[PDB]
Amino acid sequence: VHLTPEEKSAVTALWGKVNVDEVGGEALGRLLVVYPWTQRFFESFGDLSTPDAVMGNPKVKAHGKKVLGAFSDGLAHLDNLKGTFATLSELHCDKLHVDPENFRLLGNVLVCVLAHHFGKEFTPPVQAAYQKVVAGVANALAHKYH
Amino acid sequence: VHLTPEEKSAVTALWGKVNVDEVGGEALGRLLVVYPWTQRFFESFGDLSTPDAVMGNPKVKAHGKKVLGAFSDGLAHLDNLKGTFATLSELHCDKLHVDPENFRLLGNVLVCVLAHHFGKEFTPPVQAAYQKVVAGVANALAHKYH
Amino acid sequence: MELSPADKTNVKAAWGKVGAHAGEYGAEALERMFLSFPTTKTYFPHFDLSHGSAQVKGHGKKVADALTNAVAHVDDMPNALSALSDLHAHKLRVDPVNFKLLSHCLLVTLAAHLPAEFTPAVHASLDKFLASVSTVLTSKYR
Amino acid sequence: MELSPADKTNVKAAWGKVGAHAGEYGAEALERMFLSFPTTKTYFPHFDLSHGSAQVKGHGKKVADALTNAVAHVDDMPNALSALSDLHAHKLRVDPVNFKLLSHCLLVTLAAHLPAEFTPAVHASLDKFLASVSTVLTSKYR
Numbered sequence: 301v302h303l304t305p306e307e308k309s310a311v312t313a314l315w316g317k318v319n320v321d322e323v324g325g326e327a328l329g330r331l332l333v334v335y336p337w338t339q340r341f342f343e344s345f346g347d348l349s350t351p352d353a354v355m356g357n358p359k360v361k362a363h364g365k366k367v368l369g370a371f372s373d374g375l376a377h378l379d380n381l382k383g384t385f386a387t388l389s390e391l392h393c394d395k396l397h398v399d400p401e402n403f404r405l406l407g408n409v410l411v412c413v414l415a416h417h418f419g420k421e422f423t424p425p426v427q428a429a430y431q432k433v434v435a436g437v438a439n440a441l442a443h444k445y446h
Numbered sequence: 447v448h449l450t451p452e453e454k455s456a457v458t459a460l461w462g463k464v465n466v467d468e469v470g471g472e473a474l475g476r477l478l479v480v481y482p483w484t485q486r487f488f489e490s491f492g493d494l495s496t497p498d499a500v501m502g503n504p505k506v507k508a509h510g511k512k513v514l515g516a517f518s519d520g521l522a523h524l525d526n527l528k529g530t531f532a533t534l535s536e537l538h539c540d541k542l543h544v545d546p547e548n549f550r551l552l553g554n555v556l557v558c559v560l561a562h563h564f565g566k567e568f569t570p571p572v573q574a575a576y577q578k579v580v581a582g583v584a585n586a587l588a589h590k591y592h
Numbered sequence: 593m594e595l596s597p598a599d600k601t602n603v604k605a606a607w608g609k610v611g612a613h614a615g616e617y618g619a620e621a622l623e624r625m626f627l628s629f630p631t632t633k634t635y636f637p638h639f640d641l642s643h644g645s646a647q648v649k650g651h652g653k654k655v656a657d658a659l660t661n662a663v664a665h666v667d668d669m670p671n672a673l674s675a676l677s678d679l680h681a682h683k684l685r686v687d688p689v690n691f692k693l694l695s696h697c698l699l700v701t702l703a704a705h706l707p708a709e710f711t712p713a714v715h716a717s718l719d720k721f722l723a724s725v726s727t728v729l730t731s732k733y734r
Numbered sequence: 735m736e737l738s739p740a741d742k743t744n745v746k747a748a749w750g751k752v753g754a755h756a757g758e759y760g761a762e763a764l765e766r767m768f769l770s771f772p773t774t775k776t777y778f779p780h781f782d783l784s785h786g787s788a789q790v791k792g793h794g795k796k797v798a799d800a801l802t803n804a805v806a807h808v809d810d811m812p813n814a815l816s817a818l819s820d821l822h823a824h825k826l827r828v829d830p831v832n833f834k835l836l837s838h839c840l841l842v843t844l845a846a847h848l849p850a851e852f853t854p855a856v857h858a859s860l861d862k863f864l865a866s867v868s869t870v871l872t873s874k875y876r
């Protein structure tokens with residue numbers, strides 16, 4: 301993706317304060333609560349019946365961490381999101397059968413989570429830079445679908 | 447856009463049978479009838495009160511010819527849509543203020559018009575090739591928005 | 593969005609013409625969707641999606657029958673499609689975006705098969721009708 | 735999708751907490767929208783969209799007041815928002831896709847200002863509420 305110098309620095313600076321473990325679990329949990337149909341990919345994770353159940357589920361927290369850690373890796377390769385995610389793109393298509401629309405929903409929930417966690421520091425321009433990134437990542441992950 | 451040789455030849459072959467002025471007027475008219483909010487740019491065109499008034503409006507037909515003539519010319523540059531539509535992209539953003547969602551609506555209406563015009567010759571594979579082209583043109587026109 | 597009385601008239605006329613081909617049209621619309629919008633294939637990994645497969649033809653028929661049911665009960669779609677709205681919301685869990693893609697492909701299919709009846713006003717009414725069906729099918733999602 | 739009584743309670747509670755800041759938050763949501771989704775700027779060619787613009791501030795207050803009215807009339811949204819549905823359908827004619835962009839930006843704004851109150855359950859109810867508002871505002875488009 302194409303970020304201006306100001307946008308790249310916005311993204312980098314904020315990400316240095318993110319505890320991936322914690323934000324990942326929050327982001328995945330909120331995806332499952334806010335858009336419950338997404339629970340279709342996690343039948344084996346246990347109790348997902350209520351917000352509290354979802355949010356405290358250790359398997360949700362574990363997966364959340366996995367996902368955001370891979371996400372973090374892309375932050376290191378903003379110039380080549382496609383090449384970076386090619387293997388996972390094929391995995392999500394061919395083995396997991398995940399509709400790429402889910403990548404877009406997670407991107408939006410992640411933005412909500414950063415705003416919730418960071419408050420006033422997540423200003424309009426910072427949000428804008430993160431929206432570009434999240435769209436970039438979702439496009440990178442949907443790229444090998446066929 | 448990336449089309450296989452087979453796809454390009456399917457696109458070009460059908461296009462050779464199109465009456466550009468006719469299809470242009472039909473597609474624009476149907477856009478205005480099916481998604482009436484698109485009439486917002488055309489209040490100077492006169493009577494758009496009913497389907498018949500829209501389809502018969504000479505200003506609508508003339509605008510349809512202009513739009514589809516440009517589309518038609520783009521078909522010769524499938525490999526470089528972004529470059530081909532750059533100036534038009536800037537114009538639509540900076541001077542005309544057209545939300546790029548309108549390009550996507552027009553692309554879907556165009557596909558429906560081709561289907562109506564060609565019947566059985568508009569096979570699933572041919573549609574698929576035109577879906578790629580219409581999404582490519584829409585993206586190329588939305589490219590310079592800021 | 594709500595279907596006007598003229599819309600209901602338009603839909604019943606066009607659908608009436610479909611008649612006995614509803615199931616074959618349902619099948620073609622699905623094949624058009626799978627080829628045009630490959631991400632929709634993610635919901636059918638358990639099907640043989642080859643052209644003319646019995647799975648696709650049977651599914652195509654079930655889709656068309658549900659559409660016929662909705663036309664017959666256009667005045668009360670929510671009740672008519674209740675069971676289907678529960679199935680999609682609780683079991684299938686198809687992202688709502690995909691409803692727009694199938695609707696587009698059904699419109700294309702009807703266009704290719706109804707030369708005489710696919711006027712601008714009918715096209716408008718059918719588009720609204722498919723949007724309403726989609727709305728009812730996703731209404732219990734959350 | 736309908737709002738459940740728990741949704742209604744969540745919404746009234748969260749909006750209750752917005753209180754007097756509703757106008758300020760409406761302005762910030764627009765700002766977020768203009769920077770994050772630049773295509774939305776096409777509907778405001780006549781405004782100064784610079785940070786701090788009084789036009790954005792004024793419009794932010796109007797939007798927020800409409801949402802306050804919607805919360806107050808949550809059981810009767812269509813009638814309460816009737817004049818605004820007419821306005822959007824027949825004069826402004828904003829493409830329906832845009833409502834989802836503003837809704838997201840309103841959610842982000844609320845998250846950034848209501849740490850304590852923006853729980854996962856409240857987040858879900860607010861998203862449903864904004865989608866309902868969006869649906870009513872575009873109900874007369876065609």
Ligand code: HEM
Pocket residue numbers: 338341342363366367368370371388392396398402403406437441
């Ligand atoms: C930022 C976007 C995402 C990234 C970077 C990502 C990354 C990953 C990674 C690294 C794995 C582990 C692969 C392995 O087994 O070696 C995985 C698995 C998985 N992901 Fe994604 N993911 C993303 C979004 C999503 C979304 C939105 C969903 C569905 C809502 C999803 C569903 C799954 C599932 C079902 C698995 C398999 C978990 C298991 O094995 O039970 N992912 N993902």
Ligand code: HEM
Pocket residue numbers: 484487488512513514516517534537538542544548549552583587
């Ligand atoms: C395939 C998509 C399209 C193409 C290739 C296209 C192309 C063009 C061209 C070549 C012109 C004339 C530019 C000039 O004066 O130099 C134009 C003008 C214009 N277009 Fe687009 N257009 C497309 C879609 C749309 C859509 C969907 C809308 C709105 C619903 C729209 C609204 C307008 C308007 C309002 C003008 C100015 C007309 C005038 O001043 O008479 N265009 N377009």
Ligand code: HEM
Pocket residue numbers: 632635636651654655658659676679680684686690691692694695725726729
């Ligand atoms: C006009 C919109 C739609 C209608 C009327 C419709 C109707 C139906 C019907 C009647 C069934 C069969 C239920 C049964 O066997 O008892 C079904 C199942 C199913 N639908 Fe929907 N559907 C629609 C949209 C979609 C979309 C957009 C998708 C995904 C892209 C989808 C995915 C499925 C799947 C995966 C099944 C189960 C197939 C099987 O395993 O047999 N549906 N639908």
Ligand code: HEM
Pocket residue numbers: 774777778793796797800801818821822826828832833834836867868871
């Ligand atoms: C929650 C969704 C929305 C609400 C509650 C809302 C509410 C309103 C209100 C109260 C007004 C002022 C009407 C008057 O002057 O009496 C208005 C006007 C307007 N709205 Fe909407 N709106 C919404 C979404 C949108 C979106 C998504 C857009 C475009 C991106 C939009 C574009 C406009 C425009 C261009 C005006 C006229 C502004 C002016 O010229 O002063 N609205 N809206």
